[PDB]
């Protein structure tokens, strides 16, 4: 969670990653998943996500987070 | 299966970055961001999250995503 590269570091990568582990959780519980569901729908049209097509699409179609 | 450091790649950790950035923004939306520190304090117990408290307390705190 940054958009600098400068902080792109392996430390922060392992924090994000298990970070995200503790927050994906939290997202799958009832009532919780659908009001993340009713905020893709309306951050996808949000243009100031410059190159987050990708994530978008396949955090809205249920994709898997990573690639097996 | 984000617990396996077989698939901790370089593409899936770009990918768990740009995701978590996303699902960040949903984390200060109102309402979301208490039941996400509620959902947190019930969780630092469970054994799932051995070796995750500094997280946890990261989270609780509010402290950044990642260093900086
Ligand atoms: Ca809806």
Redesign the interface.
Same mark, same amino acid.
């Given at each position: 969670? =940054?958009? !600098?590269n400068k902080?792109?570091? #392996? #430390? !922060?990568?392992k *924090? &994000? %990653? *298990? *970070?995200? =582990? /503790?927050?994906? *959780? @939290?997202?799958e519980?009832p009532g /919780?998943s659908e009001?993340?569901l009713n905020?893709?729908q309306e951050?996808i049209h949000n243009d100031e %996500?410059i190159? @987050?097509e990708n #994530? @978008?699409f396949?955090?809205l179609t249920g994709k898997? &987070? /990573? !690639? &097996?």
């Open positions: 969670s =940054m958009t !600098n902080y792109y570091t #392996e #430390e !922060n990568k *924090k &994000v %990653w *298990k *970070k995200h =582990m /503790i927050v994906d *959780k @939290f997202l519980q /919780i009001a993340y905020y893709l951050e %996500w190159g @987050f #994530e @978008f396949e955090e898997p &987070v /990573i !690639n &097996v």
